[PDB]
Amino acid sequence: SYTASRKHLYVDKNTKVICQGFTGKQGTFHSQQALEYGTNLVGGTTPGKGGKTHLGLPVFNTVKEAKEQTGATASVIYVPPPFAAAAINEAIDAEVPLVVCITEGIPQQDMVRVKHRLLRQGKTRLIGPNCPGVINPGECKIGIMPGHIHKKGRIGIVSRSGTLTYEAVHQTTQVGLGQSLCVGIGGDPFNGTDFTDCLEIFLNDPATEGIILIGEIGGNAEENAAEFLKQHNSGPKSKPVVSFIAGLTAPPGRRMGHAGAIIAGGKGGAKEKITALQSAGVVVSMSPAQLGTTIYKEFEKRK
Amino acid sequence: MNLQEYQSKKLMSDNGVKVQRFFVADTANEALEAAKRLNAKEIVLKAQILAGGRGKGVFSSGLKGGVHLTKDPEVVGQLAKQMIGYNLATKQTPKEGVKVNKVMVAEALDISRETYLAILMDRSCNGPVLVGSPQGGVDIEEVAASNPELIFKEQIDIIEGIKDSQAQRMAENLGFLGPLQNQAADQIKKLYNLFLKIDATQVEVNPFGETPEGQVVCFDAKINFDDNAEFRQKDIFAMDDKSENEPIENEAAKYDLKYIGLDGNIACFVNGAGLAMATCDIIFLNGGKPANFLDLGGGVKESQVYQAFKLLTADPKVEAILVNIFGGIVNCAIIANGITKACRELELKVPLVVRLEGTNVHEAQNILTNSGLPITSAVDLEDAAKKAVASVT
Ligand SMILES: CC(C)(COP(=O)(O)OP(=O)(O)OC[C@H]1O[C@@H](n2cnc3c(N)ncnc32)[C@H](O)[C@@H]1OP(=O)(O)O)[C@@H](O)C(=O)NCCC(=O)NCCS
Ligand SMILES: [Cl-]
Ligand SMILES: [Mg+2]
């Protein structure tokens, strides 16, 4: 099953990363930042440019050659929208354990076809597209998030918004809690990882003692997350979950920047998601600026 | 994007979907000749505007009604003479109406049974879905509210394609009988292929119905397109009709800026979709009304900042501007430079609340400090929202 790849979400210092779109503008820049951060970036791919070096690392024509020649266990994709779905498909075909797609603008129908193959295998775990990536603070950064705001700690963060991930990270660092693992699942309507996938990892992770879930209008992933929490985050040793849901004031029928952020047909509203999460024991911060303080209070009240 | 009735129905017709026969006319004489060529028992003349309420609308010529039925082609031309070049005002338009440049001259069809049929991508089932109801000709979520047993769904496998058993079952659940059921099933298959061919997010037909003469027809439809696929749907996006759009949004479209106008007076300048939605939310929570949503992310360039800022300052509603950036892939100094230069060649005259975090924030704050602009720096989201609300009436 595809849920067997959920464990690949938890990057660490031993994660080895290749970059698809390595020689491109954003692939080059963030590859530099990954190397300066300490990420084990070992190479990358650009069709037709194999046999070259880039930032002192080998460039390969295919994901498979890159994987075999470096032992990479993760790939990050900076490939433009017309080709990024094929770049994801190649990484699935190469059985890369973790694939992170940053690209925004992939046709929805392309990702429907990607998910059809993705859901019928268990080797490759896909994060994204239209996502900031995943970071283990002080161990491994795969994506675009600013590393200097992070702090190794005990809050797990999953978010459909990249910028709101940075907010939660900055607030939890300021109050001293830090972060265990941050996963930005992106704002597209069809992607490789939802809230429940990350929640399963967070609940079984001893380094994770609290959770911040950031959602927004559109879809029903926040509702599915609430049902998951009702069944698996009760019990005697429950972990505190704080949430914020964007789009309380979004107008209906418009996609609010994200391809997946739209209220249509009386569905996808933020208020129903807040209600669903609260019924699952989630403490929903009304203000996005109070995520750090809200989960801090939950840590204080929990002694 | 937006398409006129004749554009989407031509798109459907070219792909084997049954719509009423029609021509489009740019002059009155063209409408007369089109009505003659139709060879139709009864003819419907429809002014082409995006907004609704054409039936009860008034033209700036004095002609009442944007939809007229007649059997005489000369009446079609005469009435079109009182339509083309005039403004049509309805319940859904600004009071000065919308200019009618084109009319539709179509065969008027009688309707004896109305159903609802839509095709879209289902986020829960990860594939296309047929959504139908035998209760057509009304609001679909109204039907879902009071009669959810009358909503029928067929989940389709994207690789397998639509199966004849799926098309036939939906046509049966829609209420079509006998040969009309086979006809409806075949139309559902052609609607499905059209849906995939044009990268639609939704093809919605209402009413999907039949004529007394026993033909299954898509009498009216709306097609929503996936903006992510414009690069491979350029011929369709070239047809986009921006004449009834908020003009500031038209200016935003010229520069590929995600702008959505709202009804407030606090302009929003944000680099993330979630943060921008959260910014609108927190302004409201602190007593303010945002004038707009703006998502300016990715590898944003200083020229995009310059244009977006000019756009916000051109809105007469705007009494203050809230800049809120948590940069990751966005370099904060690019924001600071684009704003400072904008305020040079624009003369800033509204309060500017600025909050910057993330990539290269220290260099960016130094650009703002040495600018002499009237800036009120904010500390966090709450402080930014309260300070912006404090800056306006
Ligand atoms: C993905 C994205 C960043 C790429 O933009 P970019 O880096 O400026 O574009 P470039 O053209 O310079 O680089 C793309 C490279 O990929 C390469 N490429 C194309 N197809 C490829 C494939 N199948 N496999 C690997 N590389 C491929 C191209 O050849 C190009 O490299 P080159 O210039 O050496 O030939 C951009 O399309 C995007 O999605 N931006 C927004 C991202 C975002 O905000 N996401 C949300 C975060 S929350
Ligand atoms: Cl599960
Ligand atoms: Mg974004």
Q: What is the DSSP string of chain A?
A: -GGGGGGGG---TT-EEEEETTTSHHHHHHHHHHHHHT-EEEEEE-TT-TT-EETTEEEESSHHHHHHHH---EEEE---HHHHHHHHHHHHHTT-SEEEE------HHHHHHHHHHHTT-SS-EEE-SS--EEEETTTEEEESS-GGG--EEEEEEEES-HHHHHHHHHHHHHTT--EEEEEE--S-SS-S--HHHHHHHHHH-TT--EEEEEEESSSSHHHHHHHHHHHHS-STTPPPEEEEEE-TTPPTTS--SSTT---BTTB--HHHHHHHHHHTT-EE-SSGGGHHHHHHHHHHHT-
Residues A150 and A287 grouped into a single domain? yes
Number of Cβ atoms within 10 Å of the Cβ of B224: 18
* A2: in domain: no
Q: Point out the domain boundary residue: A111, A130, A149.
A: A130
- Distance from C-alpha of B30 to C-alpha of A180, rounded to nearest angstrom: 70
Nearest residue to A247 via CA among A187, A292, A183 = A187
Of A130, A154, A175, the residue at which a domain comes to its end is A130
Of B9, B11, B389, B18, whose CA–CA distance to B217 is shortest? B18
Please state at what angle helix A221-232 crosses helix A195-204, rounded to 10 degrees. Answer: 30
Taking the Cβ of residue B150 and every Cβ of chain A, the question of whether any pair is shorter than 8 Å is answered with no
**Residue B15 CA from chain centroid, whole number:** 22
Burial label, A4 (beta-carbon count in 10 A; 0-12, 13-18, 19+): exposed
Contact residues on chain B for A161, CB-CB shorter than 8 A: 272-275, 277-278
Strand order in the sheet with A57-60: A53-54, A57-60, A40-45, A16-20, A74-77, A98-101, A125-127
Task: Say whether B158 and A116 touch across the interface (CB within 8 A).
Answer: yes
Residues 123-162 of A with CB under 8 A from B: 132, 144-146, 149, 159-162
B356: amino acid identity, one letter = L
Which residues of B fall within a CB distance of 8 Å from A81?
228, 231
DSSP B232-257: G-HHHHTT---TTS-HHHHHHHHTT-
Query: Nearest ligand, CA of residue B300?
Result: 1
Query: All domains of chain B, ordered by start, with CATH?
Result: 1-20+112-246 (3.30.470.20), 21-111 (3.30.1490.20), 247-393 (3.40.50.261)
Parallel/antiparallel/unpaired status of strands B87-89 and B58-59: antiparallel
Asked if residue A49 is part of any domain, the answer here is: yes
Q: What is the CATH number of the domain that holds A89?
A: 3.40.50.720
- From CA A198, how far away is CA A183, in angstroms rounded? 7
In this structure, the answer to whether residues A295 and A189 fall within a common structural domain is: yes
Q: Hey, are the CB atoms on A250 and B280 less than 8 Å from each other? A: yes
> A107 and A206, same structural domain?
no
Q: Quick one: A164 and A179 in the same domain?
A: yes
Task: Report the chain A residue with the minimal C-alpha distance to residue B157.
Answer: A116
The C-alpha R_g of chain A, in whole angstroms, comes to: 19
One domain for residues A98 and A154: no
For residue A215, say whether it is annotated as part of any ligand binding site: no
Ligand nearest to the CA of A191: 1
Local structure of residue B115 (DSSP, 8 states): E
One domain, residues A168 and A92: no
Residues A144 and A242 in one domain: yes
Measuring CA to CA, which residue among B329, B333, B19, B41 is closest to residue B194?
B19
As a whole number of angstroms, the distance between CA B306 and CA A14 comes to: 43
CA dist B230 and B225 (Å) reads 9
Q: Are A222 and A242 in contact (CB under 8 A)?
A: no
Task: Assess whether A123 and A181 both reside in one domain.
Answer: no
Ligand 1 closest atom vs CA A143: 47
Phi/psi class of residue A188: alpha, beta or left (left: φ > 0; alpha: ψ in -120 to 50)? beta
* Of B5, B30, B154, B204, catalytic: B204
- A180 and A251 part of one domain: yes
**Residue A210 burial class via C-beta count within 10 angstroms: exposed 0-12, middle 13-18, buried 19 and up:** buried
CA distance B254 to chain A (A): 16
The amino acid present at B388, given as its one-letter code, is: A
Q: Is the dihedral of CA B53, B54, B56, B62 positive or negative?
A: positive
Chain-centroid distance of CA B42 in Å reads 32
Inter-residue contact A41 to A35 (CB < 8 Å): yes
Distance of CA B170 to the CA centre of its chain: 28
* CA pair distance A159, A230, nearest whole angstrom: 19
The answer to whether residue A1 sits within a structural domain is no
What CATH number does the domain containing A205 carry?
Answer: 3.40.50.261
A123, A119, A82: which is closest to A103 by C-alpha? Answer: A82
For residues A81 and A98, what is the distance between their CA atoms, to the nearest angstrom? 20
A42 touches chain B (CB under 8 A): no
Both A142 and A262 in one domain: the answer is yes
For residue B207, cis peptide bond before it (omega within 30 degrees of 0): yes
Q: Which of A103, A145, A191 to mutate to test ligand 1, by most ligand atoms within 8 A of the CB atom?
A: A103
The range of the structural domain enclosing residue A84 comes to 8-130
**Nearest by Cα to A72 from A102, A41, A101:** A41
Measured from the CB, is residue A162 less than 6 Å from ligand 1? yes
Type of residue at A79: V
Residue B298's CB is within 10 A of a number of other CB atoms, namely 17
Classify B260 as helix, strand or coil: strand
Q: Which domain-ending residue is among A110, A130, A150?
A: A130
Please provide residue A237's backbone torsions phi and psi, each rounded to the nearest 5 degrees: -105, 55
- The closest alpha carbon to A162, from A176, A183, A180, A189, belongs to A183
Searching chain B, which residue's CA lies closest to the CA of residue A103?
B298
Helix/strand/coil for B224: strand
Residues A179 and A115 in one domain: no
Residue nearest atom 41 in ligand 1 by C-alpha distance = B298
Residue A3 lies in a domain: no
Does the beta carbon of A103 sit less than 6 angstroms from any atom of ligand 1?
A: yes
Do A32 and A151 have their domain in common?
no
Q: Which helix (H) or strand (E) holds B343?
A: helix B332-344
- Spatial neighbors of A158 by CB under 8 A, at least 6 apart, are A182, A183, A184, A185, A195, A198, A199, A202, A211, A212, A213, A214
Please give the single-letter amino acid code of residue A221: A
Number of domains in chain A: 2
